Design a binder for this molecule. Structure first.
Ligand SMILES: Nc1ncnc2c1ncn2[C@@H]1O[C@H](COP(=O)(O)O)[C@@H](O)[C@H]1O
Ligand SMILES: [Mg+2]
Ligand SMILES: [Mg+2]
Ligand SMILES: [Mg+2]
Ligand SMILES: [Mg+2]
Ligand SMILES: [Mg+2]
Lengths: 120, 184, 97, 104, 278, 169, 196
RNA sequence: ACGCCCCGUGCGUGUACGGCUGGACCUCUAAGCCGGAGCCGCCCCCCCGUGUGUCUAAACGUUUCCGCCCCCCGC
RNA sequence: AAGCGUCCGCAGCGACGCCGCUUUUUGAUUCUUCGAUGUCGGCUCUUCCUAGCAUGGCGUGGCAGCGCGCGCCAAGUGUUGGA
RNA sequence: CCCCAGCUGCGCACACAGACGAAGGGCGCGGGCGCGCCCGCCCCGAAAAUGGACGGUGCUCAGCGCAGCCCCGACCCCGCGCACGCACAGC
């Protein structure tokens, strides 16, 4: 909801220290790299991918997206384990029919009619 | 007393068709066809089984009294559009002969010499009403297809041709109703 | 014109609560009426709080709760399913060109 | 980035006030589509931003929906800087994430 | 308390505020009711006051000779040079279409200039292919008025070549035939005998003789105060009560008298003639 | 409101070891008004004032609404106006006894401005249809009574909507 | 948020329509009210005429040029109603009043627009049909508003043009529905979803 | 002015009131309807200011008539 | 409503009593004003009220007419010259 | 609606009423008791002088009554922090 990307369906990997969360909407699919943002800015949708891989990654150099700044970070890096776990969720997205278009499409607000309509 | 349902029906006789949509009523009778608006009543009007049915649900004594007048105004509109009404008026005078005469094919009645007056009182006829002289003299009859336009056209003459500003006990001259009946 | 009578089906007047079915079981006055839910519960409601459906169910005055509930006729969304729904109309408007 | 992409617009209708005395630290917002008090419970604690321009330069005044207000889904929000009464009738954008009273 | 002796009010409130008129030429604010069974005719004319005399006429009742003051209004024929069409809008009347002639002469375009001698006369440089399209939309009008100007140079005593332009309503039948008459009468003179006739009543609209700033005794006819009066006798003495704590507008105060618009009704035409013929 | 049967007596002393037990059936808002309406009747029928009353029991008389039909209720009441004190007999159809007196209170307030505290109920009896004395409540005791709804009621909360939208139906 | 409302004024109680209008106006909505000659005043007409004659009686005795101005149009009389439901002497209320435009009938600027109603202010919802009522145009045509008949005639010609365009438009909604139900359209649609 | 001319008619709501039809056997009334005052409102008349329509205009901020207005001059 | 009014309480009055309204009388009071609000009447001039005198429409009479009484609606226009 | 905060149900009333009032009245409407009473609402009685005041807009479910749940609202109360005073784990 609030990041560099800020309307992008991504997938959630791991909760990191100082209230952060590891996420990667897979960079082949939606052109979104690995990042960490604050835990709260992720609006949770009900659908979960079947990812079995360990998410304890070398987080020391991952680009962290702050709230208001849209600061133009440097492009993609060496990606030692990031290429493997990206391909595992490209493997996960291929099983489900329309899920590739889902993660590519930017999020639109649902047309409000009630708060029941805002379930996600 | 708030009865749960008061209902009365007006038997539509043979030769006329009644059509009711959103509380207006179009009667197609033999004598004339008149379209009547009854939307000042708060009622359910429907024609079913050859009699126009008026129903009132949970109505007070004020409302069901208005139910009956809607029934009687439908009875009058039907036999006005079927038979037609006619009102008979007697011209009464002590000294001065009043001369009543019809113009505009009975759409207006002139009254002259009323109490020796020079002013010619003309009385027009509300729509589809025809005045003519009575077969008995000193009478004229107004005849039309609706009781309200008949009785108002006669009623204006009975109201305006009385004697005012001079003592009405000693001066009895004026035009009065004799007899009120339907045509035939 | 739908009538308030015993056996007349009804629903709450609000559109969000039209999934609930009622059936009129007893009439108190011009304004109050017992309705029975499909789950068997009865409650006294106002006639103004109901929207009368067109159907009348064969019920008489003194029937058990189970007897009336036999005669009552039988009655969610995700973000991804909403996406699959909106994508269907997304292509549907494109074909019409 | 459009604010209406991820956030629900709410019109700043009044400050929290008496009949005369006005407490400008709490702003009353009417969220669109929210019409009842229990519907607005979905937005308790949610962050809210008021976007404005100072000398053509964009600013974000961030806040938190603090409490409900009334029976009609009006909510009271407290921002970093108080909303001016000039902006009454304009829109502020209600986020879909909860923030805390200390940390907007 | 009540005034001791009652009297009528001095002067009509119908004409207060007595201001100066906005122009010297007055437009017709109301034409007569257009009757479709009447033939096509104009409803107004613009004349010039020449002077007064008195005539002697036989007043049949036996015949009794009476003399009466008349006044003579010189009426050179007015040239119709444009048409204005109107539609009945829920806000009132609206200009449907204005159709002018191709020719506008030096007299009537003197009106469009403040200083004409120093002008370049480029008003109304103005196509005849759009006439039938402009006549057709003009046939959709509700009210048809012609634009007519006076020929002030024909008088020559008034040192005025600058013409007076005005709209005159075409009253008659079937608005189609109103504009078919009006396009026929473009750049044509309309006589005073075509509009009016003798022994018919007309309304005159004009601006009175200006009297300048006048006191209340001339402006309203209030009583001159007695001889003993300090601070002036040609006044109203009490200009108001204590309450309301302002002066009412109904109190006669000194101000502009004359040069007011006035419409006088039912002025009878005794004679229509020509100044050259005897 | 609720129905209470409140048992009470004089406080037993050495002179009177078992005083006479009294009970009152009160339609009250809560037990504190029910104690209050009990204490006045012991003060005015007998001469036992409230300081020497022990309230032995207060029970909520609640009816079982198992199949929930409508019964008829004839209510004999005594209401005090601003001008005097009068007797009235009103008939209602309702669910329970405690709902029928709620219909009594809303009717005496609507028709006579009698507040709830200005009304004392002599008796409430559930009645047959044959024993009902009011012809207005008799009309709804007939089987197969039916009427339509003529009042418009909205189907949501709206401030402004387009013209085509159904709001009443 | 589309904060622009076009209200059709027929069948609306006047002060009840005005409260929902003024409350929207102070929240930044721009309201236009059409058909203001048909805005309803409840009660019998003679009581409503006595309320108007009480309004006409109030004028500044000192100088009626600055007195309480008396409006004979239904649009300006309805504007005068909503004028004091906002704080119009303050700048917040006067700015809200600039977002009202009240018209009699439907002007051709508002041809083929999408008109709204306030259902809580409708006469059929609020009033009892036993009670009498009268519109603005019924009242003010006997107080110097001469344009009732020309309003209703031009109202009808707008409604007949709009009913014509609705007769064309819903047929296009009919044929698009019949096309979208066709199996030729469906297998065209599932072919694109196959490729995605 | 002490003199002369003009202030003419209309229309509508509808007061009191009289009526018509007509309910809860009559009934002007509860629904409906007709007539109806020097009242009231239009019309007319006067004022106001905002609009509408039409007309018209060259060059490279300066030149200047390209469109004009204002002062000045006269009445 | 006792009584009067040819008979007749109420056509019109109306005792004995009783209930109000008004602030156009005069008191009562002393709240404002005593580092001042110019104190009667008239003249002049404007406006307002109705508890309606005339003019408009009516209803009623113990109204034949003429007149007169009583009542209603209406505050538009009027309501003078003098000792 | 001004103006922060309302919805669900049950009644009642039509008089430019609610929005100053008496004695005396009203086949006005709604309840109740034995044609007469009683109780609510309404009506008549009910007339002042600048144009004008339920505060206004207005309202005929914004009036007169009631019930249920809810909401708004003070420097009050509670909690916290600070200032000052006190004989100072505090008040
Ligand atoms: N109590 C009632 N009894 C009979 N008809 C009624 C009643 N109330 C309303 N109506 C009629 O119902 C119709 C309007 O209902 P609706 O379908 O809501 O427009 C009109 O014909 C009314 O006269
Ligand atoms: Mg002196
Ligand atoms: Mg002094
Ligand atoms: Mg002084
Ligand atoms: Mg509010
Ligand atoms: Mg404190």
């Amino acid at each position: 909801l609030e990041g560099d990307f800020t309307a992008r369906r991504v997938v959630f990997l791991k909760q990191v220290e100082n209230n952060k969360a590891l996420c990667c909407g897979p960079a082949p699919i939606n052109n979104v790299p690995f990042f960490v943002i604050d835990e709260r800015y992720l609006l949770r949708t009900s659908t979960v991918l079947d990812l079995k891989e360990d998410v304890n990654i070398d987080i020391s150099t991952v680009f962290e997206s702050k709230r208001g700044v849209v600061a133009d970070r440097m492009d993609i890096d060496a990606n030692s384990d990031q290429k493997r776990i990206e391909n595992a969720i490209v493997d996960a997205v291929s099983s489900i029919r329309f899920m590739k278009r889902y993660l590519a499409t930017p999020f639109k607000m649902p047309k409000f009619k009630s708060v029941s309509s805002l379930k996600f | 007393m708030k009865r749960l349902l008061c209902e009365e029906k007006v038997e539509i006789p043979e030769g006329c068709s009644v059509e009711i949509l959103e509380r207006v009523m179009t009667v197609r009778g033999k004598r004339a066809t008149a379209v009547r608006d009854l939307s000042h009543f708060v009622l359910t009007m429907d024609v079913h089984e050859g009699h126009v049915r008026l129903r009132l649900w949970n109505g007070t004594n004020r409302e069901r009294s208005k139910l009956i007048t809607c029934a009687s105004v439908i009875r009058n509109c039907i036999v006005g559009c079927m038979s037609g009404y006619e009102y008979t008026l007697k011209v009464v005078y002590k000294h001065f002969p009043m001369s009543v005469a019809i113009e505009d094919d009975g759409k207006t009645v002139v009254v002259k010499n009323f109490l020796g007056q020079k002013h010619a009182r003309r009385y027009k006829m509300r729509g589809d009403s025809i005045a003519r002289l009575g077969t008995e003299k000193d009478t004229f009859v107004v005849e039309g297809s609706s009781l309200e336009d008949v009785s108002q056209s006669a009623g204006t003459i009975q109201e305006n041709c009385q004697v005012k500003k001079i003592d009405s006990r000693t001066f009895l001259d004026g035009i009065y109703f004799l007899s009120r009946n339907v045509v035939g | 014109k739908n009538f308030v009578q015993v056996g007349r089906l009804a629903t709450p007047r609000f559109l969000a609560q039209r999934n609930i079915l009622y059936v009129i079981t007893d009439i108190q006055d011009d304004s109050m009426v017992i309705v029975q839910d499909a789950q068997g519960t009865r409650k006294l409601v106002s006639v103004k709080s109901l929207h009368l459906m067109d159907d009348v169910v064969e019920i008489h005055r003194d029937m058990s709760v189970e007897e009336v509930s036999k005669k009552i006729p039988q009655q969610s969304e995700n973000d991804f399913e909403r996406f699959k729904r909106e994508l269907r109309t997304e292509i549907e408007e494109e074909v019409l060109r | 980035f459009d604010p209406c992409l991820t956030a629900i617009p709410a019109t700043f209708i009044s400050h929290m006030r008496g009949r005369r005395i006005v407490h400008p630290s709490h702003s009353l917002l009417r969220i669109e589509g929210v019409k009842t008090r229990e519907d607005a419970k979905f937005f308790l604690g949610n962050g809210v931003v008021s976007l404005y321009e100072l000398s053509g330069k964009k600013m974000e005044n961030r806040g938190r929906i603090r409490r409900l207000h009334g029976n009609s889904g009006v909510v009271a929000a407290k921002f970093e800087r108080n909303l001016p009464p000039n902006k009454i009738g304009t829109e502020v954008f209600v986020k879909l994430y909860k923030v805390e009273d200390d940390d907007y | 308390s009540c005034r001791k002796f009652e009297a009528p009010r001095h002067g009509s409130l119908a004409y207060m505020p007595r201001r100066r008129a906005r122009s010297v030429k007055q437009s017709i604010r109301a034409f007569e009711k257009d009757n479709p069974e009447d033939p096509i005719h104009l409803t107004a004319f613009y004349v010039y006051k020449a002077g007064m005399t008195h005539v002697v006429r036989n007043k049949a009742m036996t015949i009794k000779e009476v003399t009466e003051s008349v006044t003579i209004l010189e009426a050179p024929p007015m040239v119709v040079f444009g048409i204005v069409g109107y539609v009945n809008t829920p806000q009132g009347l609206k200009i449907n279409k204005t159709l002018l002639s191709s020719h506008i002469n030096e007299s009537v375009l003197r009106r469009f200039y403040r200083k004409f001698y120093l002008s370049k006369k480029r008003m109304f440089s103005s196509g005849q292919k759009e006439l039938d399209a402009d006549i057709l939309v003009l046939k959709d009008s509700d009210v048809i008025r012609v634009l007519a100007h006076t020929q002030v140079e024909k008088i020559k005593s008034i040192r005025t070549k600058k013409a007076h332009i005005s709209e005159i309503q075409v009253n008659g039948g079937t608005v189609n035939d109103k504009v078919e008459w009006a396009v026929s009468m473009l750049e044509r003179e309309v006589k005073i005998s075509d509009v009016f006739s003798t022994n018919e009543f007309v309304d005159t609209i004009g601006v009175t003789k200006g009297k300048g700033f006048q006191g209340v005794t001339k402006r309203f006819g209030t009583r001159i105060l007695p001889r003993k009066t300090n601070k002036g006798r040609r006044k109203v003495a009490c200009i108001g009560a204590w309450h309301p704590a302002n002066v009412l507008r109904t109190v006669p105060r000194a101000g502009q008298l004359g040069f007011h618009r006035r419409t006088e009704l039912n002025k009878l035409i005794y004679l229509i003639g020509n100044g050259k013929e005897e | 409101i609720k129905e209470y049967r409140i048992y009470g007596s004089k406080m037993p002393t050495e002179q009177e070891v078992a005083p006479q037990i009294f009970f009152h059936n009160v339609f009250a808002k809560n037990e504190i008004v029910a104690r209050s309406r009990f204490n006045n009747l012991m003060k005015t029928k007998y001469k036992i004032k409230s300081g020497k009353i022990v309230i032995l029991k207060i029970e909520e008389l609640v009816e079982d609404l198992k199949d929930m039909k409508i019964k008829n209720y004839g209510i004999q009441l005594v209401y005090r106006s601003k001008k005097g004190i009068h007797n009235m007999y009103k008939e209602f159809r309702s669910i329970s006894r405690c709902k029928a007196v709620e219909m009594l209170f809303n009717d005496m307030a609507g028709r006579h401005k009698a507040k709830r505290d200005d009304i004392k109920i002599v008796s409430l009896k559930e009645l047959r249809s044959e024993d009902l004395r009011r012809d207005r409540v008799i009309q709804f005791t007939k089987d197969d009574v039916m009427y339509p709804v003529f009042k418009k009621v909205l189907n949501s909360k709206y401030d402004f909507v387009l013209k085509g939208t159904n709001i009443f139906n | 948020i589309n904060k622009e409302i076009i209200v059709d004024g027929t069948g609306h109680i006047a002060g009840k329509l005005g409260t929902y209008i003024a409350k929207k106006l102070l929240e930044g909505y721009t309201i236009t009210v059409l058909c203001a000659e048909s805005i309803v005043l409840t009660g019998p007409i003679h009581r409503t005429k006595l309320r108007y004659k009480d309004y006409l009686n109030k004028r500044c005795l000192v100088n009626p040029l600055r007195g309480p101005f008396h409006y004979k149009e239904p649009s300006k009389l309805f504007m005068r109603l909503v004028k004091r439901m906002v704080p119009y002497k303050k700048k917040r209320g006067a700015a809200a009043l600039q977002r009202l435009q009240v018209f009699e009938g439907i002007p051709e600027k508002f041809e083929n627009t999408e008109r709204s109603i306030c259902p809580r202010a409708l006469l059929e919802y609020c009033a009892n049909p036993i009670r009498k009522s009268a519109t603005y145009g019924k009242l003010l045509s006997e107080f110097g508003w001469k344009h009732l008949n020309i309003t209703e005639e031009m109202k009808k010609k707008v409604l007949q043009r709009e009913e014509k365009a609705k007769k064309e438009k819903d047929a296009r909604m009919e044929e698009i529905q019949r096309i979208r139900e066709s199996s030729s359209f469906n297998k065209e649609v599932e072919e694109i979803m196959s490729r995605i």
